[PDB]
Amino acid sequence: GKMLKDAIDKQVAGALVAGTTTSTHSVATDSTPALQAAETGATSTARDESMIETRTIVPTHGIHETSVESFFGRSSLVGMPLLATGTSITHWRIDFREFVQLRAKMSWFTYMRFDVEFTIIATSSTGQNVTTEQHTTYQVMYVPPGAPVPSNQDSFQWQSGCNPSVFADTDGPPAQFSVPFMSSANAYSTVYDGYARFMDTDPDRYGILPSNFLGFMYFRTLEDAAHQVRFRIYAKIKHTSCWIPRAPRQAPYKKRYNLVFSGDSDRICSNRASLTSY
Amino acid sequence: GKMLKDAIDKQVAGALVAGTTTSTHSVATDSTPALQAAETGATSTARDESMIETRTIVPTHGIHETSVESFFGRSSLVGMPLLATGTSITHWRIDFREFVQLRAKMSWFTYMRFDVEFTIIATSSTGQNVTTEQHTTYQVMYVPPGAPVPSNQDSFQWQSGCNPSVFADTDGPPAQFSVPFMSSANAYSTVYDGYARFMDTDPDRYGILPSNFLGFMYFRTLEDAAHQVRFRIYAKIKHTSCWIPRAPRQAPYKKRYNLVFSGDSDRICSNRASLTSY
Amino acid sequence: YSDRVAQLTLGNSTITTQEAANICVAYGCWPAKLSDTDATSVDKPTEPGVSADRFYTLRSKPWQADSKGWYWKLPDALNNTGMFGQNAQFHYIYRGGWAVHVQCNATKFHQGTLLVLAIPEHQIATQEQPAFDRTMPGSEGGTFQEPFWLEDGTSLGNSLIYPHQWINLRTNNSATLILPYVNAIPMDSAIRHSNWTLAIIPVAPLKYAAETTPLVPITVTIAPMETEYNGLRRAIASNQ
Amino acid sequence: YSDRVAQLTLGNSTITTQEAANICVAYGCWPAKLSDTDATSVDKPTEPGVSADRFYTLRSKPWQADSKGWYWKLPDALNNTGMFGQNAQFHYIYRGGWAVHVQCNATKFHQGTLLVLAIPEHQIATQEQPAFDRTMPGSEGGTFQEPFWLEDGTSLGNSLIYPHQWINLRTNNSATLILPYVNAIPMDSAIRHSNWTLAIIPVAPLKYAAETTPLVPITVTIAPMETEYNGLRRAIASNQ
Amino acid sequence: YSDRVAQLTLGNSTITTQEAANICVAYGCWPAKLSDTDATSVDKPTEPGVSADRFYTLRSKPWQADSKGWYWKLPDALNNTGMFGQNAQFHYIYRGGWAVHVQCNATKFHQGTLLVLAIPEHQIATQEQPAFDRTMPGSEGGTFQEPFWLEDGTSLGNSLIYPHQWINLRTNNSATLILPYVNAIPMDSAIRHSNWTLAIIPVAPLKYAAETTPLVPITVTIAPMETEYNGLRRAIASNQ
């Protein structure tokens, strides 16, 4: 049926890399492809065929593993809240900045528009952190800014009449759910050269764009936990638009909410004793 | 729909064995099918019908169980890493050379192009190796050459932002996944008459083709293991192209990364006391 | 026929250079006004025209032997200047592009190379989160302290991904960049957010054919382009 | 009409034999040049033509009563010989086929049989991993120590799967094999990898109609065929 | 539009110059292969292609105050270099043209003029018949002792009849000459006969705007062109 045709999108990865045309020797004063001028800011236009004698090469290699979708389109850890047994409650602030691998991958772009698939793995363990048996339901509640936060395991906030929740078992399959692009802005921002507030220039609000922050995930067990639970929160970025590539992060990350780095030794690649030998 | 027709391939195993035509007696000097010359390197051309008087036989037997696909197209053990409780981490180097049955089956060919279905069975046991109960998630991370290896159970490498991982339960169904033909070469090589490196002829790099080596699988439990875990790694070879058949391995295998054999008693079949009796 | 000679006329103002390289147009995107499909603010914008879309010259900088570099936030650097500055002060939100012209002449007896970066959303840090005098330095601009790290934990070497030109003294005395508006929203406040940073970083140091080092200034000239303003209220000068 | 008489003309060189069996063409594949669809290296290959595509004769070997066999790696055996050798030394990568001709005459008063194997990717081992003097023995070739196991833990009996002929002294005095290029990649280094091994193994020992055993040499003659070379640099002779 | 900027691409090698004069093509004759009507040798030639038809750079020479000049025989100078050298060693006879590029840069603060002669059949003498170290000096080349007489009892002034360019330091830093094969026979031996001599003779001496004389090298770069070789045998390096 055509109605089911609406739920199917045929999508194709068949873009190839550029090929090579055979070329011959050139002795002239007409064509000088090797002479360049980096001052313009343009990258060199010279190609293989104009610099040496080439054979013909039919293109066969795809480019799809470096499409922005493929590069971001896998799951990565973004949150690891620990539910202790004293209160049986925990939360994770929602952003991709606690764990460095996804953050550094995002640092190649300025603005990014995407959806998210979240995946939550819960693991129970003892005080000495050895795996242990515990079968219990847990509740993950999305708490958006301005909604009252639960303060206990039995708080009546966990009613969840308006906050969306997911209920799953600690020893069941992983909870998984998708999320549309939720920013009030038309993209997310990986970096922000401004202040979070008018009438304020506190350093702690520099580089803080609050339209990236959609709130909190809160976690309880539905009864009081017998053992601590660790939730691992994975995000896969999908349906991805990217704008304005950047110099990628090179210094290690130090803080969650700013770009501070050490910068004690100004170098990235390793040293050698002489430029004319390895 | 035609779009779903793209995801279906009708494929048929109906090739038959050769039949037999009836023949009669031949008394001539014209046709001598039994006279051969093995010196040319050609196999004998003489057939049944030209050597004896045959009846007619309609072909009925298939050949599909000896198609290269069917011969390789089943799962075999290729790796058995043991996760101890001291570090809760282990790894398996990815190649089909630890276990002899698959390796000997591959030794019939020189070059082989295939995909792989991997299947992982995890089993928990005590120190005395008796089966025991342990419910825990584990993580298998593909670590390709040049990616930093995890050194502990809690290493931040297990973030897995760019390495693909599979998470499954020790007492759940077996993890299973497919893999395309990944060699930088246009086929894999079962045997290599060369050196792994320029400017080096060390015996330990003879017969080593590093384009067969796609890296490592690393294994942790998501908490610290209470009992040791044994992962059994099965590979099924599929979508298989094979070139250049070989004399198959006859001496037992001795080492993982070379063809060394004992060769103390030069024979394969068993002996008898006389060639004219059994 | 000659991309070494250029003339830039905006408003009542005209720049010339006899040693340009070319003109960099960032992301191949000439500045353009906001379309009705992307716009959200319902009030009718003020478009000041030539009163603001004109070249403004900042104070010059001496290129010294030890210079690490200089930077300016936009619109920050022009927020107190002319009718651009006044339109930016009197409106809540602003949008527009830039025409940037960096001047530095020296002799055929000099050597040295400047890198001229226009960096969008150039959030900066060092070993510490920066204060307001560095995030929004005004018309006088700021100076780099970690030019190798591009003040942001990235690397100067990879900043050629950003729109740029060089001033290599053997070749040219000026760099020109045309910048489109870049943001994740249609308009944004001029006092709270800097959409672009103009960064001028010495890569090859300045050397003279004698040991006596005369004064070689760097001079920045910036024209706003295709500007709109919405949200008229009293004039507010800074985010403090 | 007669596949016992052959003539092979390559370059300035011509072989004849009045007792051939036939000609073995391995896998029914005549050597052929690399097509644009399978090629990866972008530089234009050098094709030396007749300067290299010609028969080269190696030094002869005596067939002794105790002989276990002989072997040569290709291109290894010809890497220091003629313009083939020079083109292989001066390029990073090489591709091509072979025309192999093994000569051994004896009398109608002799008996004995040689097996003549062309073995692709013939990686060798014994009770130990072999040294360079055995993996790449050069023009003089190596000798078998485990002829029953084909130096590789397989069996000589099953090596008829490889392209082969016999020299059975009652029948023929020569074997001819045409070998296509075989590899898992389009081109490969001549000094680092041997695509084929020519193996000559006595199966029926050499017997004479007297007890006085005159000298019966074996002689190998090899012509490269349809050669290409890419990656021109200085000449490099061996992988050591 | 500009005969001051040139690029020469042969094989895997490319030369550029931003101060050329033009390109001299000797006798208006681009190098060309030997036609069946003029050829005598019946064997099929080897044509090595890009393996030999490429630029080779000789060692540089210092231009000193007293320099009388330098010279190289061709093919002599390249007979031990690369795959050209190997093809010339392994064949009895050879034919081909040349692409010659002489480099010498100095300053706008220098003066001096080089004459760059390609002299066909340049047989040399002085008060004595010359020895082998002067008739065939190899890659290092020889030096003039009678530059006024062009080493041959003629005159330097009249050698403009030969194909030539100047390097006048106020004008250009490089000379390019394309040379056809010249001989009285179709092919000839590379080790016994030199068809061309590249001669670089200072006419106006080298003067600097100070008395301190920095190093000003001359550098020769030569590409064989349209080469053929016949008469394949062992490699023979020199006529000694």
Place this chain on the structure above:
Amino acid sequence: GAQGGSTINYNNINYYSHAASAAQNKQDFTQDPSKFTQPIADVIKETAVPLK
């Protein structure tokens, strides 16, 4: 796609209502490298001299 070479051909079938539920997009989209490599007002053809 039961295989052309480097052509992955996929029918993304979303079972849920919201487009955000769909799996990741496998299309190759247009590449305009020249907005980053040739970001200049006057085109400079490869065979020309860049300056002047």
Place this chain on the structure above:
Amino acid sequence: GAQGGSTINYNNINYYSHAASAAQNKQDFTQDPSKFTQPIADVIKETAVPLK
């Protein structure tokens, strides 16, 4: 195939995007035994004498 004799007839249905995900191929492919059994320049018909 609800059965012809020795004809297995299969509709391989791949549910995933990558062709590598598909199950194993059940086609019988062409057999050219003679590239290995008759690898000789001159064909020798069965009824002829091989040598000469």
Place this chain on the structure above:
Amino acid sequence: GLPTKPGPGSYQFMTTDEDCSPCILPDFQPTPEIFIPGKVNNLLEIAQVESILEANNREGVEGVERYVIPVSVQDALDAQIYALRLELGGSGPLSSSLLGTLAKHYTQWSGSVEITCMFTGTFMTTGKVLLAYTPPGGDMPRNREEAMLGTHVIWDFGLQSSITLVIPWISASHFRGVSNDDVLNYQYYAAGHVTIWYQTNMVIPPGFPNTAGIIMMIAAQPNFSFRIQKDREDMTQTAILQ
């Protein structure tokens, strides 16, 4: 959700499953397939290639010599040269050949087999040989008179060095068992006997070698097939390879 009923066999792993499974690298684009000579689509292309029988399996013969059956000048008439039980399984001489090693991977076989023999004596050495195939039911034929009653070829040594005895598929059933499994009485599948006899004698000129050789070779005919993969008996290991 669609109502379902998972049944028996849920979550099992069968090694011969034919199921699609998620790809861990769904965006990967492999290197093209290039032309390589000698592509094999079916292992019966290998089984039709002749290989040498390890035929001289007498106790004490080692190495290459196990491949040459002795043939001598006889001093008595109608003598026996060779005897061989026709078996693709077990451990006798056929078991180590190309066909025999493939049969090690399979449980059942059908079709005709051919044996090609090459004489290696001097040019001047003459002889005639009887090659016999005896269908099953009894023992190995005891004399040439009994062996000749079966399928047989008679070989004249000459310019054409080699002969073929085609062992035709003669069988009560469409298939036989490869193995000779005793507990299962797979001797039920006994496939007969191959014997070689002097038809006249080997004759030599004075002072020539009085002993020469036959190199036996075996291969499958085009009517041959195998069923039921099974593990190879003699490809074992006591430890993981390191």
Place this chain on the structure above:
Amino acid sequence: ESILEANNREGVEGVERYVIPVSVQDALDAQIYALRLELGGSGPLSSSLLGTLAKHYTQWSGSVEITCMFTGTFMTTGKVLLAYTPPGGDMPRNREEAMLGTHVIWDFGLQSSITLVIPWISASHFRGVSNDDVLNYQYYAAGHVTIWYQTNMVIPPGFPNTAGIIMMIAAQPNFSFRIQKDREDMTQTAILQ
């Protein structure tokens, strides 16, 4: 194009690591620079845009180009030889050996910059990015880039006798990457707070 951290000599810090020294020579045919062609490891190519992308991938194919910009005074002249040597041996020892490879010859002048195109010259369709020792990924050795004085750097009296080359690198349109992998040098010992 991005700038190579090419002047990686021990003791050079900061922006100066981006300028290779070029001087007036007192001897002929001297070497300016040497560089092992490698997208992996930790040498100068590893910190560039192409090198940092290669940190996320396991395999690479295609041609690479290196653009060099001279920074001496207008009056400073020179000619330079830029060589690419395919693998099999060591780094070329002298300009005579290096010239036997792919090479361009650069004349300092009005057009400030030159391109040496390093063409994809390779036995296989793809190479390994990394130099993983246990796995012998040195199998994928991709050759050498060296820079030589073709004539000399020449200056008027009393000018700076030292100038610089800024090396720049980028991929050609025939280039690609396979197999995502984790970046080696982007680590953390703790969750960020």
